[PDB]
Ligand binder design. Structure first.
Ligand SMILES: [Cl-]
Ligand SMILES: [Cl-]
Ligand SMILES: [Cl-]
Ligand SMILES: [Cl-]
Ligand SMILES: [Cl-]
Ligand SMILES: [Fe+3]
Ligand SMILES: [Fe+3]
Ligand SMILES: [Fe+3]
Ligand code: NA
Ligand code: NA
Ligand code: NA
Ligand code: NA
Ligand code: NA
Ligand code: NA
Ligand code: NA
Ligand code: NA
Ligand code: NA
Ligand code: NA
Ligand code: NA
Ligand code: NA
Ligand code: NA
Ligand code: NA
Ligand code: NA
Ligand code: NA
Ligand code: NA
Ligand code: NA
Lengths: 169, 168, 169, 168, 168, 169, 168
């Protein structure tokens, strides 16, 4: 593995751990707010946090198997106060776009350095990340379609609860 | 509902478990690249993942009880270690510290008559105890085998067997 | 052998559970016929919860009989029957469950003080089930508040609770 | 809809069933602790108490489904002191005869007021109550046949234990 | 690791269980040969003796797995002469109450010293011992209910035989 | 009916088996915690052998009860607890098994002399099992001596015994 | 081939078994008709008679297969009058002790004369006879424990009926 690819992979491990924390904090906001219980969204975000940690694990396995040191850096406290349900999913979606871009950057570097084993390895991750980014866009758009007049938050929360349930099953 | 003190201790425990997860990943990586000791490396990786599972279970409990989760900043884990004995000695000491921290929570739950929380924590007391004992056993086996000749190989194979039997 | 204090607290708990069971039957009936819609989802849920409370009473009576302790049943007061609305009924129910949780904690505390470990051990199923019940009532109450009662809110809330009742049996 | 008179009689019947349930729990406890335990009789009476509560529940379902208010009354503290096993079963049997009579009164009323849906619904209850009344008469008579000289109480208790077990 | 005080109490508990096992073997033999054989009671007491040894073994496993030395003491010669069946079950019941109290003492100590892993482990034992104590009370009371006039001893022995058979 | 001598020898054998069981539990504990490594393979093996010795005691008690002979339990002396090393512990255990074999031979011999064939016949399972145990201890002792204690010898020996324990249960 | 002395002892044993079978048939009949029927004891003794004949047959097979002449003697008319149920089982038990002694004598002889094939063959018989002797002692003792006041004979007969049924 090249020096640059090693550095980018280590940074990606750290980004995934940071994402996991961020989504746990968002999950907690859904259940208890900046200090309603939106348990559908809360469950979905918790499960997504756990999935991000699974990505970090898979990257660590790859580093260990390739004999490259894993360099875990300090963990920053995630944001814990959010304005509302739309805003939380808008931040999440933007965050997923940033993660997509960071993976694209690694893949691009693997092509440039002719590291095709690493290119090949990363395909599961490109593909899963894309599905995640699209899923967040879809939920964000559904929250906006439903609206928050009357029982809109309830309907949105039930919609997201359904998505969470179907992705575990 | 939960007392202020119990909430604070539970949040601190979530952070301690995340910190443990990172520490064990760093130890795992030292095993692979610090000689490659893949048996120890796999075992420690799996133990890191298990600590994160403990953090998750605690977060579920907090969410379900409507208590805010406060994830804090954590220092980077130590990454340089002196040798295989020393790494397992540090790990074991760390597990004893985690045991003590859980005992403190359980003690506070008794004092504040929070028996729902006492009851919840029993799986965690039990699993943590099994972990602490397992680390002591591995440490002692590493010392029984010794590092003369192929001792490190035998120790690594022994630990590889433990890792395999605990996933199965 | 059980201490005098523990015997008295266990007997009081039998009587409290019978009282709770009747209270939940009365709440159930309010849902079906209270002064003015039929809320059969909530009505079914509360009926089922009433029956479960009586099962708690029965389990405590079995324990007393098996331990050779006399059961001392007192008069069980007629429950309250008039309620102001759906939110209020679930607010009262939730507060009532919190009171039951406290009363069990008090017994458990006394078992520790008198070193009655057998009784401590017996009571753990009850601590655990009670906590699940208290949380369930908090969740329903919060959902009722999220939905609101503008337009078909009450219908939505009732359908939500109907679904919970069905999934728990 | 159900007539006013029938509604009142049905609610009174619910209350009688709840009252019976409590009385039989108290009788059950006397068997266990009223030394020595009559656990056969104690189990049988406990189970009969539970069955009476099942009847109360069935009646409440019918009221809820018919859109009629359920009006639960206070349940009086039951008798707790009894002179002996014969006397307890004599009281129980007399109590079951009273419950039979109270059901007959409702059914009679349903015929007179032309509430045939209610008449039809109550048939399971007429039938089950009759079986209960007969069962109590049979047990009481068996207790009398066995007698209490020597180990007569033991024999009676074992007989009733057998009945309790076969009915579960 | 386990505290010094808890280690000592746990070892004492092992020894109490071994002592109980021997006492119940002696009581079993009195039933068979203390003419006539009370083989129902004899079988029940033998089986209970074996169960006490199973408790001793479970405790020893816990000590071995926790790296604590097991210190077995001499087991005193048990009482072998008894006045009758009531008296034997009265002694047995009192003995079970003493064992219950000794377990409560350890559990209490575990709470006070914050050894929650040990508290958690001991719950199976608290629960099983309570069932045993109650079972002895029930048998003793049944022996008293049956009496010894005529074939009372036979009836009592057949009752206990039935219990022994259903518990296997 | 059993002779006086046979009754006394059978009672003595009950007490010897209880004493053996305790001795093997103490040896087991030495393996796990003796003054200085954890030898859990040997520890498990010896625990299991202790339990089996107690099963021998139980079978003899059943025979006495069924034959209407009083069981006369004496005090069971505390076992020895300090041992010098792995070789020495298995040397003591093997010698102890040889002594038990002799004590059974003495009973069998007395049964022949008193023409107590029923007792002779009963004792054959015990002669046979004891012989298998004695041989097993000789085999382990010899294996411990073949491996030696230079380097990881103790570890190898402990793994060997662990395998025997596992295959016997 | 079998020695002359062993052949004679084996033939005598066949004859003893045939004689036992007849004696137990007579005892069986006394139970049924010696008013009232003790059919439990009657069935048990009949079945035991049949079992003794099965032992005779097994011994005859061994003699035939070893090429030794079987010499059957006259079977003496058995006792037919007995004083009561205790006395009948006391005679039966004493008879079983005599049969045990006669088997011990043959086995002893086989050791002394070095006929180990015969020693080996006889082990099933030593073992079965011992179980029979013990069973008769147990029944006799139970008859004594129950007593004959009131319905004691009925209880004893039902007890033995149960044994007969479980052994088939
Ligand atoms: Cl930070
Ligand atoms: Cl921070
Ligand atoms: Cl009323
Ligand atoms: Cl001691
Ligand atoms: Cl002859
Ligand atoms: Fe709508
Ligand atoms: Fe009788
Ligand atoms: Fe080697
Ligand atoms: Na992602
Ligand atoms: Na841990
Ligand atoms: Na209503
Ligand atoms: Na409740
Ligand atoms: Na009583
Ligand atoms: Na319904
Ligand atoms: Na009433
Ligand atoms: Na009835
Ligand atoms: Na006896
Ligand atoms: Na173990
Ligand atoms: Na002792
Ligand atoms: Na016990
Ligand atoms: Na050791
Ligand atoms: Na042995
Ligand atoms: Na007759
Ligand atoms: Na043949
Ligand atoms: Na003859
Ligand atoms: Na015979």
């Amino acid at each position: 593995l090249s020096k640059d690819i090693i550095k980018l992979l280590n940074e990606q491990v750290n980004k995934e751990m940071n994402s996991s924390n961020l989504y746990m904090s968002m999950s907690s906001w859904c259940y208890t707010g900046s200090r309603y219980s939106l348990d559908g969204c809360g469950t979905f975000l918790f499960d997504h946090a756990a999935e991000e940690y699974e990505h970090a694990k898979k990257l660590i396995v790859f580093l260990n198997e390739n004999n490259v040191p894993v360099q875990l850096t300090s963990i920053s406290a995630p944001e814990h106060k959010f304005e509302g349900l739309t805003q939380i999913f808008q931040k999440a979606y933007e965050h997923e776009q940033h993660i997509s871009e960071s993976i694209n950057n690694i893949v691009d570097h693997a092509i440039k350095s002719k590291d095709h084993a690493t290119f090949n390895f990363l395909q599961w991750y490109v593909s899963e990340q894309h599905e995640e980014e699209v899923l967040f866009k879809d939920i964000l758009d559904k929250i906006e379609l439903i609206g928050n007049e009357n029982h809109g938050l309830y309907l949105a929360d039930q919609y997201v609860k359904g998505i969470a349930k179907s992705r575990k099953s």
